[PDB]
Amino acid sequence: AFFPTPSGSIVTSESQLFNKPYWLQRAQGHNNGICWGNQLFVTVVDTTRSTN
Amino acid sequence: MASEPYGDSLFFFLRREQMFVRHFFNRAGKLGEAVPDDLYIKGSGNTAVIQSSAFFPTPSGSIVTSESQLFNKPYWLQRAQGHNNGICWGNQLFVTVVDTTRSTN
Amino acid sequence: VYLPPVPVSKVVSTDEYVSRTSIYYYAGSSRLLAVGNPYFSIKSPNNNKKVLVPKVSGLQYRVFRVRLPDPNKFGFPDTSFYNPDTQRLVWACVGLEIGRGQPLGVGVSGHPYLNKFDDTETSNRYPAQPGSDNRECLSMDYKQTQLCLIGCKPPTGEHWGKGVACNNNAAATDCPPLELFNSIIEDGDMVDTGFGCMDFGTLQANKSDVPIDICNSTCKYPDYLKMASEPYGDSLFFFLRREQMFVRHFFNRAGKLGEAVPDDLYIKGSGNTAVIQSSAFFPTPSGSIVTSESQLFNKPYWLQRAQGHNNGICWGNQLFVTVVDTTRSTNMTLCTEVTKEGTYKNDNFKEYVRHVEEYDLQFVFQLCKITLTAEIMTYIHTMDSNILEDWQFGLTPPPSASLQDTYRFVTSQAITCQKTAPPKEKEDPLNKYTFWEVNLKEKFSADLDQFPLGRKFLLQSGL
Amino acid sequence: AFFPTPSGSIVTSESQLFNKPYWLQRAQGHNNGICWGNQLFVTVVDTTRSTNMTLCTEVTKEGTYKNDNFKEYVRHVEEYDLQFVFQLCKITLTAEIMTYIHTMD
Amino acid sequence: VSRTSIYYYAGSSRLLAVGNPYFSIKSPNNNKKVLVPKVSGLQYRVFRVRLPDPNKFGFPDTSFYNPDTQRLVWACVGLEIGRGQPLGVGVSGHPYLNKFDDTETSNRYPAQPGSDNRECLSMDYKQTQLCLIGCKPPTGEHWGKGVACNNNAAATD
Amino acid sequence: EVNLKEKFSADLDQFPLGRKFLLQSGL
Question: What GO biological process terms does the UniProt entry carry, in alphabetical order (chain C)?
Fold first, then answer.
C-alpha cells in the first residue's frame, strides 16, 4: 500500500499568471460577455504566495 | 507501420517521453556468463569471491508540467502522412491513448 | 624589394564540371539488427577464434558501409540525354533518414573492482584506514551523446597514448610521454565517456579505473579540426552533434602519489596527520534526463550545400554513415532456473544479461553526368587513380619517361642484391578494417512515392 | 563564519561560444577593427573541457593486488586553434592626421 | 581610414600544450627550470598574434596606392576559435582544507575538542566562458592588501 | 606567442573559413 509525497519545483516570476490585463475578445461560450442579473463570480486560487 | 504499402494504420501520431535514473542496484544469484580472467587482477582476503556483476537501474520520471501536455486541444488533419487522406473504410476507427501523467493512486 | 610567392594548383568545386539532371531514385535498406552481450565478448573454449556470443553495446561507433550499383551498367530505355562515349555517370546524394526503433532508457554498467578509496564530498576524517587491498564494487553511468556523419571516405579519429621518450636527463622523474595519433574509426572501438580520449591498454597497470567494457579498448573521438581542413572535402558532407554531462559524486584514488605535492604550499601536519592522503581525485559522470525533443533521428535531412568542395558527389560508389547513440541503450536481464521448487534460495537461478541495438536506413539519390574532356581528365587523376581506372576506359603511363637512367642491372641477381620487391596492388587499403556492411545493389527503385521518403521529398521540392 | 562550496551544472553542447564564426560589423569602441602596430590580443577562458586523466605505471608484476606497487600521475592537455580573415586599408596621410596619430602613441 | 576590397585569409597551425594541472614541478638542485609545466583549464590563455607588415609585403599589383603619401594597415573582419576535446568537467581539491563541521542539517552540540581538524575535500568550479579581442592587452582587477593607516588605535587588525 | 608571420594566402576559397565568408558577402 504505497503512496508518494508530492513537492513543487522552483516557483519563478516569469511563469506568473496574475498582475496582468486580460482583454476578452471572444469567449468560448455563446454568452459573449453579457452578465445577466448583474453579477460575476471570479474564482482565484494561488499557491505561489502561501507563506506561513 | 509507416512503410506499409497502403498506409492504413496511421493518420496522425505524436509522442513525448522522458526518464532519468534515481538509484542503481545489483542482483543476487549465480552469474551465468562469468567474467573472463584477462581483464583484471585477482586478490585474497575480503576479495575472495568476485561479486555479482549484474547491475540494473531504476527509472524515476521527472516533473509533470501542464505547459507541455498533448490532450484537450483540437487537431485538424490537413494532410495525413500515408496515402489514405483520412478516409476510413468499413465504418470504424481506432484511437489509442497512453497517458501516465494523470495516474494518481 | 618583394614579389608574390609562387602559383600553386587550386582545387575547384563540383558545381562547374559535374552537371545534374532530374532523375531521382529512392533506395533503402531493411531492418538491420544485432543481439549480443553488453560488456565483454564471450569466447568459445575449444576454438579460441570463433566468437560464440558477440559484443555489442550502445557506446560503440556503428560505422556502416553502404554499397551502390555501378550506374554505368544501367540499360536505360532512352539514352537520349547523353552520348555514351564522351560522358560518364555518377551518383549524388540528396537525402537521408537514419531511423531507430527501440524505446528510451539510459543504460548503466560498472566494474567489480573499481579503485575507490574513500568519499571526498562531506566527510573524510583522520587517520586513514589501514589495509593493503581496499577495492569495492561500484557502478557509474555514461555521458549522453549523439552524432551523425556521412561522407565518401571513412572518418578519422584521434587518441592519446604512450610514446617515444627522450635522452638522458639526470633529474628526470619516471613519467610516460604522450603523443597525439591518428587512425581510421572501425566498428566497436568505444567512444569517450568523460575520462578523456586516451588509450587504456598501455597506460594502466592496475587495470582498475573504468568499467569492464572499456578496460582494454582505446576510446577514440572524432577529429573535427583535421577533417574539415582537407581541400578536397571528401570526408565530411554533413555532421550533427549534441552532448551533455554533469558530476554526481567525487572519488579519490589509492596508491603512491607518483608526484609529490611540494612542501611550500601547506602547513605541515602532526598528531593524527603524520601521513598525507592522495590528491588524485576522479569524478563520476552521470548524464541527465533524455527528452523526446532533443533527438536527432527519424527526421529527414536534405542537403543542398555540403561544408566542403564536394557538393554531394560520391566517387567510388560507397558512402560511410556513422551513428553513436546512448539514449537507447537499455540492458535487459534473463533468468532461466535450474530446478522447479516452492522455496527461494539464491543458488537455483542463473542470470545472463543481454542487449539489443538495431537500426534502419533510407536514401534518395540523383543521377549526374560528367562531361569528360581534356582539361578534366588530368584533374581527376591528380585527385585519385582508382576513379580513372574503374570506369574501364583506360590506364595511365605514369611518367612520360624519367631523367635518370637508374642503373638497371639485368644480369639477374648474384652480386649486390638490390630491392627486388615483386609488387601487388592489394586492391584497397580499406580491407583491413571491419565495417558493418549493407548492400543496396538489389534495392533501387525509380518510382518514389510508394515509399516513405518519396512522399516527403515530393512536397519539399514542390513537384 | 561560513563559506559555501560552489558547483557547476549541466554543461550542454548548445550553449557554447566556440567553433562558429563571428563577423565584426561595428565594434563598440571607436575603431572598427584597425590594429595599429600589427598585433592582436585574443583571450580565451574555458572550463567546460577541463577534464583530468589518470596515468598509472607499475614497478613489480604479480598475481595479487596490493596498493604498494603502482604509481599514479595526473596529467591534462588543452588543444587549440585559430583562424582569421583580414582586409586592407589605406590611410590618406595629410598634415592634420600626423598629429592625430602622434598624440595617440 | 578608407577601405578596399582585398581580403586575406591567415590561419594558424593548431597548438597543443600538455602538463600537470595543479602545480608545476621544478627539478631539484637547479630550481631555475621546470620539468612539467603547470597547465590547467582555469587559466587564461592570452595569445598574441603577429601580422606581417603590409609595407614589406608581396603585393601582385601595387597600382592601387600611391606609396609616397599613403600607408597600409590590417583590419580584422572575421574570426573563429576552434577547440577540440571531450566535454568533461574537472575536479580539484586540497588535502588539508580547513573544514570544521557540517552546517546544513545537524550540528547538535557540546563543543568538539582537538587541535587540528583539517580534512581532504574536493569541489569543482563555476563553469565560465569568455572571448575578447583587442589591440592592447586586456586589463583586469583584483583586491589585495593595503596601507594599514598607522593611526587611531585600530582595535580590529 | 603564436606566429602568423608567413601563413597568409590571397586565395580565400581553399580554407575552412574562406568558404563561409564568401557566402556571407552575397558573392
Answer: endocytosis involved in viral entry into host cell; virion attachment to host cell
